[PDB]
Design a protein around this ligand. Structure first.
Ligand SMILES: NC(=O)C1=CN([C@H]2O[C@H](COP(=O)(O)OP(=O)(O)OC[C@H]3O[C@@H](n4cnc5c(N)ncnc54)[C@H](OP(=O)(O)O)[C@@H]3O)[C@@H](O)[C@H]2O)C=CC1
Ligand SMILES: COc1cc([C@H](C)C#Cc2c(C)nc(N)nc2N)ccc1-c1ccccc1
Length: 157
């Protein structure tokens, strides 16, 4: 299976100045649950924004840099390389990789953050005419989770 895994706000913002614009531990738990024991594929900039691979899953970084080498990270140099990765593969970020992959993936796990944040990085536009809502689950508002958010699982029609 090839899936997108993303959190975006009401205007599809996913990032600002190398950071997630919001703080939502519940969504990090969601990521951990979905992707543990599987594979994350991310662009070079997304990886460097996090700085270290996420534990207990395969971390794959897409870059043109032939010297790129990080402990606990597997490197690929082409989009075509993604299709050779075994198991459940999650396209993890960023804007560039999402733009290259949105027309290719089987499904998308999207956390819709019900706010409007300042951003410099965006998920590509998409229409529900193309995507069936397999599930839609409201996140719980919390001491440490104070922004409304909805977990969507979308499957290509
Ligand atoms: N929510 C998120 O996913 C977050 C992501 N970001 C980020 O994304 C922001 C915008 O940059 P964006 O370009 O979207 O980031 P990406 O993570 O998509 O990284 C882009 C880089 O990935 C590599 N890459 C992408 N496609 C190819 C390809 N077809 N062949 C070879 N290499 C490829 C290149 O690396 P190289 O240049 O080394 O060759 C390219 O410059 C950055 O500011 C970064 O912080 C920021 C905050 C949050
Ligand atoms: C390791 O967690 C992160 C992941 C990211 C990348 C960009 C991501 C993502 C992502 C999230 C948070 N949610 C969903 N649903 N999909 C994603 N791809 C960025 C910063 C962080 C981060 C780094 C340090 C502290 C807190 C968060």
């Amino acid at each position: 299976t090839l899936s997108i895994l993303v959190a975006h706000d009401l205007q599809r913002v996913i990032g600002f100045e190398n950071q997630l614009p919001w703080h939502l531990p519940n969504d990090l738990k969601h990521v951990k649950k979905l992707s543990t024991g599987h594979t994350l594929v991310m662009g070079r900039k997304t990886f460097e924004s996090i700085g270290k691979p996420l534990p207990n899953r395969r971390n794959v970084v897409l870059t043109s840099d032939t010297s790129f080498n990080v402990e606990g990270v597997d490197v690929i140099h082409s989009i075509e390389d993604i299709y050779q990765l075994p198991g459940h593969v999650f396209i993890f970020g960023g804007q560039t990789l999402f733009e290259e992959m949105i027309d290719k993936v089987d499904d998308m796990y999207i956390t819709v953050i019900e706010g409007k944040f300042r951003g410099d990085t965006f998920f590509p536009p998409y229409t529900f005419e193309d995507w069936e809502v397999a599930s839609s689950v409201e996140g719980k508002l919390d001491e440490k989770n104070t922004i409304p958010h909805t977990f969507l699982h979308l499957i290509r029609k």
